[PDB]
Amino acid sequence: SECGPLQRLKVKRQWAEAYGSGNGREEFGHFIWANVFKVAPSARDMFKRVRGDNIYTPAFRAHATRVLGGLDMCVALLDDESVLNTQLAHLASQHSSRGVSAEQYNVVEHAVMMGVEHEIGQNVFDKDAWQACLDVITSGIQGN
Amino acid sequence: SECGPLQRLKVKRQWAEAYGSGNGREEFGHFIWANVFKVAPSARDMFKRVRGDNIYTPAFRAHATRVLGGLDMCVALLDDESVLNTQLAHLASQHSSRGVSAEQYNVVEHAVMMGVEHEIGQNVFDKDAWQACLDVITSGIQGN
Amino acid sequence: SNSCTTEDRREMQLMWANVWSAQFTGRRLAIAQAVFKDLFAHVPDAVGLFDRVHGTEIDSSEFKAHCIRVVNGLDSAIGLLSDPSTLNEQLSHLATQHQERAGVTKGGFSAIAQSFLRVMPQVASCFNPDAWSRCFNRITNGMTEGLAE
Amino acid sequence: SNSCTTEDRREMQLMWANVWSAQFTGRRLAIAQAVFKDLFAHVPDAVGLFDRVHGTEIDSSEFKAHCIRVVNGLDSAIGLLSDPSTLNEQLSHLATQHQERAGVTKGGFSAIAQSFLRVMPQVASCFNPDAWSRCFNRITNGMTEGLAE
Amino acid sequence: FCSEADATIVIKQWNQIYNAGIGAKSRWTMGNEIFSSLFKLKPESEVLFNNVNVANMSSGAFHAHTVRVLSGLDMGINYLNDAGTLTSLTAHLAAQHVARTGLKAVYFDAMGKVLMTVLPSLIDNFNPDAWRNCLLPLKNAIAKGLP
Amino acid sequence: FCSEADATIVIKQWNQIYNAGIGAKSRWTMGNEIFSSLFKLKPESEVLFNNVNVANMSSGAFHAHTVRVLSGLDMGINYLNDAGTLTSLTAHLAAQHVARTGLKAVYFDAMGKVLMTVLPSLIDNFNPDAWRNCLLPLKNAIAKGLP
Amino acid sequence: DCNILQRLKVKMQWAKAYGFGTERAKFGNSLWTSIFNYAPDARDLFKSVKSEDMRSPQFKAHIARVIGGLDRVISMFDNEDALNADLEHLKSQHDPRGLDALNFVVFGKALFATVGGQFGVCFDLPAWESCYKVIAMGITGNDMFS
Amino acid sequence: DCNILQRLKVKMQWAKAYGFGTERAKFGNSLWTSIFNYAPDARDLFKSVKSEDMRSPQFKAHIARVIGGLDRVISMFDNEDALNADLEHLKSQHDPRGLDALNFVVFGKALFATVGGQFGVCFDLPAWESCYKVIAMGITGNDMFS
Amino acid sequence: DCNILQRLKVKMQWAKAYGFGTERAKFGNSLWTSIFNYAPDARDLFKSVKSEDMRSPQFKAHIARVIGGLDRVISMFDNEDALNADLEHLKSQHDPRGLDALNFVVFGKALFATVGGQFGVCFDLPAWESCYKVIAMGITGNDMFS
Amino acid sequence: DCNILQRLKVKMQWAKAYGFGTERAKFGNSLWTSIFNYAPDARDLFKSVKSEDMRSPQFKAHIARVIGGLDRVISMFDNEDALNADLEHLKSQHDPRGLDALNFVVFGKALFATVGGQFGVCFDLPAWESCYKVIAMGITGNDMFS
Ligand code: HEM
Ligand code: HEM
Ligand code: HEM
Ligand code: HEM
Ligand code: HEM
Ligand code: HEM
Ligand code: HEM
Ligand code: HEM
Ligand code: HEM
Ligand code: HEM
Ligand SMILES: *[C@@H]1O[C@H](CO[C@@H]2O[C@@H](C)[C@@H](O)[C@@H](O)[C@@H]2O)[C@@H](O)[C@H](O)[C@H]1NC(C)=O
Ligand SMILES: *[C@@H]1O[C@H](CO[C@@H]2O[C@@H](C)[C@@H](O)[C@@H](O)[C@@H]2O)[C@@H](O)[C@H](O)[C@H]1NC(C)=O
């Protein structure tokens, strides 16, 4: 599927519901990263500085806050090609020296998708739109 | 992390909430052992006498009741070094002829931890305190 | 009828929860030790049944750990009164644990039943002896199936 | 007391949510750009601190992306006011991001604080400047721990 | 002192680990951890507790001291919404401390950092800002007049 | 007979597997399982049902017998809270059984164990204590006067 | 009449109006209050169960047996073999009483009024008239119910 | 008296009737309203804390310290060492005041009425009489509390 | 002592804790539950009224007689002639049963906890202690209650 | 005036006070009740849409088009190109009607009162005065709205 103008609009509104104002954000981020580390326990080592061993710590919850804020900026920029590419390049440099595999970006991608679906319900979740538009985001964080 | 006096107090109160008075105990024990046997299906054979094949049976629910009661006695004794060691030694003899691996004690350990978190919420669950103080308990059930 | 009714079950779990300490053995240990003190002072030859857990030394760590086990087993049974299917299985496990021990009979349980009937009003508020003993007996009935009189 | 109270925290999240756009940068970009326009017109030497993101060209894609980052970081902090444990960690991360940069001091944050105090009533309904600045300062206090005056 | 909503948070998180239904063993366990930590930040202050047998922190005398310290702290917490009474309660606590020779106000600063350090290990969702907004007015009101 | 809360449990768990909205095929399926089990515990009693063609338990006559047995059991269950009427209902059922030659009270004991055995296979969260407290007074009141 | 559809319809509406627990006794009391009001002479036929006092445990017991009989017969509406066998059994109990068959007509009227007044407007009276005929025919054998 | 069971019983019923937050001050105000009503002469003993106005922050502060003292002492009921040590500490504070021990008897009556009136019918008055004796004995040393 | 003012207070607090209708039965059950919890051995003294089962009609009749005796005695607290006539009458019914007068001390404790737990915090325990003594002295004649 | 912040502010408060569904028609009816009350002479200008009866489907249709016009114009406040293009389109429709520009001033007053009376106290009247000028300027071209 393709991340066209319509899919970007749907993803935008569905993200706003899942991400919310701030009250369910701690649970939202927890659900995502409990999934990431379950599917890929080996990924924990890259998060040594932010207590990847214990995602219940305030240290890691702040990291999950930053990750979600990064997704929020990209989703909000999905209708702004030029600015989105600039922000995606900034995220790319933030991960450049960390050796993040393409397999791991897909793991977090799936966790983000299970988390939004868990937050808004399988009844409305648009898997094709979300898969296509997160691909656009992750692929820009990997350079290409 | 270390299972010091403060962590023992936190674990005590968090266990009392999760274990409760008796109404949610059947669901509490079920959640734990559905996790144990999912992560390690091979462990079922050691529970032949108590219907490890079918954790819905009254036979196994009574076994889960005994396990939780054993944990309750240890948690309640975490502030009583001398008596706790006596009870832990009693649990050790109850498992001596069963060949329980150190890997399996960690599986049940993780299931107990996911069950308490599922019962009280990820929002309050103290992973470091629970990991450290269950280590003290399991390590005493294994002799050392 | 003298049967442990649904009503009697609710009342016993209330009498028990209003005394039980969910975090510290201090209240459990006190009740249990007080029960066996009563039992030993009424049944002198019973102390020798607990030679293994230092029954003569009620304040030893060995008998403290045994008291906690007894009270834990009673607590599990009182809670399982809400689920008699599972309760029946648990009471069978307790029965075989009290089986194959000479001196452990149906007469000692009637004695400890009186022990609880004297200890509990001293520590429990709003204690109902009628509703308590009807379900306590219901519990001991499963614990003494294959025991001598 | 001038302390950011639980009350003040609720009010700020209301002042912020009634302006924040959850789906489109149009409202975030406008607020942010307006803040730095105010900051630059009051602190002229500040523009050179953002040489890297084209501070002189407020409508460039590079500074648009920086504005979005600043507003995203403020949004995260305002939301984390409900969870100060995590908030304290996040404010430390922001502090080291503003550290090791000559010209970035505690005086620039007092200036941008006034910038927000002039921008926000123009776009926010029911704006409370007292409750806003008490918690805005609480936020900047963590962001300026190891900074020069 | 501090706002009603902040005070409500502090009071609730305090009853969670401290109330009338809690055996004294956990009371002096917390007290021993608190004071042992105070003697690690300010070793000079351990000499001030010689009258209550600080030499043996397992003694009945020192257990009782920590119990009445935490009880006084509990008393201040539970009167956060009665500012007039809290003023009198803290004024009395101040007199009980100014009279003690060797006490510096910095020792109460150190106690504050000990409380901010220990309590999160004990309390679910410990709110350090609501606790700071309320404890710091308490700390100063008890250390008011101290060197 | 039995307490109101116990009776409430029995009645609810009974309507779960037996009510007016249930086709008779499941009615005699349960009846066939119940009586086949009774003939396995007490084979001597199968001769007593010769009048309703127990030889063929798929016959219309024996299906009808089990249906009216379960209907009578249903009638007693649904009057557990009307003790005066249940006394009359069980007195009538007793007369309908005392008159039958060859019936021992032990046969009703065996039927009780069959019910306690079969019903958990059919009923969600079967409560054997609430059922014992209520069925045993029913069983005795129907077997009252039996040899 | 009383085809298979009407038999299912009757089973549906019966289960609803009959209900659970003590409502069953209220239905039964209403059914018999109607019978004795439709035909006051019929009351003297039930002195063996103390119809002198419809609140007595004796008559309450009779009510329960009767409506329990209706329920089991209606439940077997879809199986001719079991149905006729039980109807024959009811006939062998009622025949020695030498009952005027006109009272089974009265019973039917009271049953329709009670079920329909409990079930509501969607009561299928023709189906209940047809399928009650099948019941009264099996118990009495009278061609008045043909 | 005041065995270990009665000490636990007293700790239970105290925690319930004492409650949390502002209810604590209401309990304490009731306790002292009773003391001054039982013995009006006792009020003049507390002019150092402004018993002239029981609503004043001075007397409210006194109430808090006293009931806080009861709570900590009751909390240490299960540890003799800490208990007696704190009771000795209370004795050293009350001895220089030269208090008639008959007022500690009055205090006990007012405490029983307040706790029992707050806790309800299941109040164990004998246990509270026994275990208060232990408290008043430690503070006064008077064998009136033997 | 129990002076006229204390008699008025007790009459007023009794009337209120006692209540109307089935509240009296519930009041009475609590008093006797407390008595048998305060002294389990005293229960065997009441086999004449089936104390084995406290919800039995025989024991509920005894409860009603006892709290009925309390009510009428308390009501006559302000007439010495009538009051002493009834206490003498109650003494004549109790004396040939050889009761240990210490059980009347236990009874008073349970009465205080029951009335007080029902009436609330403003229960006057000194008033009730002194006036119950007058009752227990009138019934037992034991100068224990002097 | 009417900077980008005021344009966002106006878009916010408009969306809130405008609402969804039938409330939209109630807002619109209130807006036009105010216009005709502020300037009764303006009513005769709308006989082509049956302003003779503001409840008629003809005038209700006119109300919908107008407030729909406000909504789309306010929605384009952040895009000059689309905004001016639509304002030119509205100007080409209103110019042949030869409307006194003083009625667009009246329209603005009625709009402020309706939005502010629906939105509440936090209504930003200066921002609405500035940004309505931009709208009326685009439709009329009159420098009265400068
Ligand atoms: C797919 C969308 C992702 C987003 C939106 C995202 C966002 C972020 C952000 C905003 C930061 C903060 C950087 C800083 O402030 O220094 C960060 C840090 C980091 N991210 Fe990601 N990230 C993504 C994917 C991943 C993946 C898939 C991995 C590894 C499997 C990863 C590993 C890391 C690491 C190791 C850090 C450094 C944390 C630290 O030690 O401070 N990221 N990420
Ligand atoms: C880690 C905490 C554990 C606790 C508190 C615990 C507790 C208990 C208790 C109280 C019993 C009852 C013994 C008796 O009454 O005879 C029991 C039985 C048993 N446990 Fe554990 N246990 C733990 C760990 C494990 C693990 C990790 C395994 C295997 C992976 C295990 C395997 C068994 C088996 C096979 C039995 C015998 C059941 C039977 O056949 O009757 N236990 N446990
Ligand atoms: C409600 C009453 C009772 C309960 C709930 C109870 C429960 C228990 C439990 C849970 C154990 C631990 C078994 C194990 O860990 O393997 C135990 C052990 C034992 N009990 Fe009981 N019991 C009760 C009454 C009695 C009585 C009345 C007697 C004797 C007259 C008795 C004699 C024993 C003995 C001899 C042992 C084993 C000694 C040992 O484990 O070191 N129990 N009981
Ligand atoms: C509430 C106020 C502020 C917030 C929330 C904030 C937040 C942020 C954030 C999130 C970044 C992105 C860092 C990164 O992506 O690595 C950033 C960058 C930066 N900020 Fe701030 N900031 C604030 C105030 C200020 C002030 C007052 C100054 C200077 C006087 C300043 C100077 C800078 C600089 C120089 C950079 C890095 C340039 C670049 O990334 O290209 N900030 N800020
Ligand atoms: C929240 C903090 C504190 C509270 C609420 C508090 C309160 C109290 C209380 C109630 C007492 C006993 C008064 C009595 O005798 O009736 C006490 C004793 C004392 N406190 Fe504080 N205190 C606190 C912190 C400190 C600190 C930081 C120090 C520094 C050394 C200190 C030094 C002492 C000393 C020396 C005593 C006397 C010990 C003795 O009896 O020999 N306290 N405190
Ligand atoms: C809950 C248990 C039982 C109930 C409610 C019950 C009730 C009934 C009822 C209602 C009937 C038909 C009465 C009629 O003709 O109108 C019946 C028939 C009969 N029952 Fe019972 N019964 C029960 C158990 C038993 C048992 C254990 C036996 C032992 C053999 C037994 C033997 C019979 C016999 C022989 C008949 C007569 C069959 C015939 O018509 O030829 N029943 N029972
Ligand atoms: C569909 C209609 C009817 C059904 C299903 C029915 C069913 C029953 C049943 C189940 C019994 C109890 C048999 C027993 O256990 O001994 C009974 C008894 C009886 N029935 Fe019927 N009945 C119906 C109509 C009538 C009518 C219309 C009359 C008379 C006008 C009648 C007269 C009697 C009498 C006199 C008894 C016995 C009374 C006694 O035991 O003293 N029935 N019936
Ligand atoms: C169990 C009973 C009692 C307890 C637990 C208790 C406890 C206390 C406490 C904690 C203080 C505060 C000490 C301080 O911080 O300076 C105090 C002070 C005092 N108490 Fe007691 N008390 C009890 C009974 C009594 C009685 C019966 C009297 C007199 C009839 C009394 C007279 C006083 C006085 C006069 C003060 C000091 C007033 C002042 O500071 O001006 N106390 N008591
Ligand atoms: C303190 C106030 C008491 C009052 C007002 C009271 C009143 C009464 C009354 C009215 C009766 C019924 C007399 C009759 O009609 O035969 C009665 C009976 C009796 N009372 Fe008391 N009583 C009191 C205390 C006690 C106590 C403390 C005990 C023993 C512990 C006691 C033992 C008995 C006994 C054994 C009976 C006979 C029960 C029977 O009829 O079998 N009374 N009392
Ligand atoms: C911001 C202010 C206004 C807006 C957005 C607006 C918008 C509109 C719209 C959308 C139409 C429908 C065009 C069509 O589909 O044919 C219309 C028609 C019309 N407007 Fe305006 N209008 C405004 C103010 C006014 C004022 C102040 C007047 C006169 C005092 C006026 C007079 C008319 C008339 C006479 C019509 C046509 C009536 C008809 O169709 O018979 N408008 N306007
Ligand atoms: C410190 O105290 C420990 C606890 O013992 C209790 O307190 C002491 C002060 C005595 O009063 C004793 O009777 C109590 O049981 C002792 O176990 C420990 O040995 C003491 N340490 C030293 C160095 O004496
Ligand atoms: C037993 O009955 C089975 C069911 O058939 C039905 O019942 C019998 C009694 C007849 O009335 C028949 O017309 C019914 O359809 C038979 O299928 C089966 O063959 C019978 N078994 C024997 C041995 O005859």
Automatic annotation (TrEMBL), chains A, B:
<protein>
    <recommendedName>
        <fullName>Extracellular globin</fullName>
    </recommendedName>
</protein>
<feature type="binding site">
    <location>
        <position position="109"/>
    </location>
    <ligand>
        <name>Ca(2+) 2</name>
    </ligand>
</feature>
<dbReference type="GO" id="GO:0020037">
    <property type="term" value="F:heme binding"/>
</dbReference>
<dbReference type="InterPro" id="IPR050532">
    <property type="entry name" value="Globin-like_OT"/>
</dbReference>
<dbReference type="InterPro" id="IPR002336">
    <property type="entry name" value="Erythrocruorin"/>
</dbReference>
<feature type="domain" description="Globin">
    <location>
        <begin position="2"/>
        <end position="144"/>
    </location>
</feature>
<dbReference type="GO" id="GO:0019825">
    <property type="term" value="F:oxygen binding"/>
</dbReference>
<feature type="binding site">
    <location>
        <position position="135"/>
    </location>
    <ligand>
        <name>Mg(2+)</name>
    </ligand>
</feature>
<feature type="binding site">
    <location>
        <position position="109"/>
    </location>
    <ligand>
        <name>Ca(2+) 3</name>
    </ligand>
</feature>
<feature type="binding site">
    <location>
        <position position="49"/>
    </location>
    <ligand>
        <name>heme b</name>
    </ligand>
</feature>
<dbReference type="GO" id="GO:0005576">
    <property type="term" value="C:extracellular region"/>
</dbReference>
<keyword id="KW-0813">Transport</keyword>
UniProtKB/TrEMBL annotation, chains C, D:
<dbReference type="GO" id="GO:0005833">
    <property type="term" value="C:hemoglobin complex"/>
</dbReference>
<keyword id="KW-0813">Transport</keyword>
<dbReference type="GO" id="GO:0005506">
    <property type="term" value="F:iron ion binding"/>
</dbReference>
<comment type="similarity">
    <text>Belongs to the globin family.</text>
</comment>
<dbReference type="InterPro" id="IPR012292">
    <property type="entry name" value="Globin/Proto"/>
</dbReference>
<dbReference type="InterPro" id="IPR014610">
    <property type="entry name" value="Haemoglobin_extracell"/>
</dbReference>
<feature type="binding site">
    <location>
        <position position="98"/>
    </location>
    <ligand>
        <name>heme b 2</name>
    </ligand>
</feature>
<feature type="binding site">
    <location>
        <position position="101"/>
    </location>
    <ligand>
        <name>heme b 4</name>
    </ligand>
</feature>
<feature type="domain" description="Globin">
    <location>
        <begin position="3"/>
        <end position="148"/>
    </location>
</feature>
<feature type="binding site">
    <location>
        <position position="98"/>
    </location>
    <ligand>
        <name>heme b 4</name>
    </ligand>
</feature>
<dbReference type="InterPro" id="IPR009050">
    <property type="entry name" value="Globin-like_sf"/>
</dbReference>
<dbReference type="GO" id="GO:0020037">
    <property type="term" value="F:heme binding"/>
</dbReference>
UniProtKB/TrEMBL annotation, chains E, F:
<dbReference type="InterPro" id="IPR012292">
    <property type="entry name" value="Globin/Proto"/>
</dbReference>
<keyword id="KW-0813">Transport</keyword>
<dbReference type="GO" id="GO:0005506">
    <property type="term" value="F:iron ion binding"/>
</dbReference>
<feature type="binding site">
    <location>
        <position position="96"/>
    </location>
    <ligand>
        <name>heme b 2</name>
    </ligand>
</feature>
<feature type="binding site" description="proximal binding residue">
    <location>
        <position position="97"/>
    </location>
    <ligand>
        <name>heme b</name>
    </ligand>
</feature>
<keyword id="KW-0479">Metal-binding</keyword>
<keyword id="KW-0561">Oxygen transport</keyword>
<keyword id="KW-0349">Heme</keyword>
<feature type="binding site">
    <location>
        <position position="97"/>
    </location>
    <ligand>
        <name>heme b 3</name>
    </ligand>
</feature>
<dbReference type="InterPro" id="IPR014610">
    <property type="entry name" value="Haemoglobin_extracell"/>
</dbReference>
<feature type="binding site">
    <location>
        <position position="92"/>
    </location>
    <ligand>
        <name>heme b 2</name>
    </ligand>
</feature>
<feature type="disulfide bond">
    <location>
        <begin position="2"/>
        <end position="134"/>
    </location>
</feature>
From TrEMBL, chains G, H, I, J:
<feature type="binding site">
    <location>
        <position position="48"/>
    </location>
    <ligand>
        <name>heme b 3</name>
    </ligand>
</feature>
<dbReference type="InterPro" id="IPR012292">
    <property type="entry name" value="Globin/Proto"/>
</dbReference>
<feature type="binding site" description="proximal binding residue">
    <location>
        <position position="94"/>
    </location>
    <ligand>
        <name>heme b</name>
    </ligand>
</feature>
<keyword id="KW-0813">Transport</keyword>
<feature type="domain" description="Globin">
    <location>
        <begin position="1"/>
        <end position="144"/>
    </location>
</feature>
<dbReference type="GO" id="GO:0005506">
    <property type="term" value="F:iron ion binding"/>
</dbReference>
<feature type="binding site">
    <location>
        <position position="93"/>
    </location>
    <ligand>
        <name>heme b 1</name>
    </ligand>
</feature>
<feature type="disulfide bond">
    <location>
        <begin position="2"/>
        <end position="131"/>
    </location>
</feature>
<protein>
    <recommendedName>
        <fullName>Extracellular globin</fullName>
    </recommendedName>
</protein>
<dbReference type="GO" id="GO:0020037">
    <property type="term" value="F:heme binding"/>
</dbReference>
<dbReference type="GO" id="GO:0005833">
    <property type="term" value="C:hemoglobin complex"/>
</dbReference>
<dbReference type="GO" id="GO:0005576">
    <property type="term" value="C:extracellular region"/>
</dbReference>
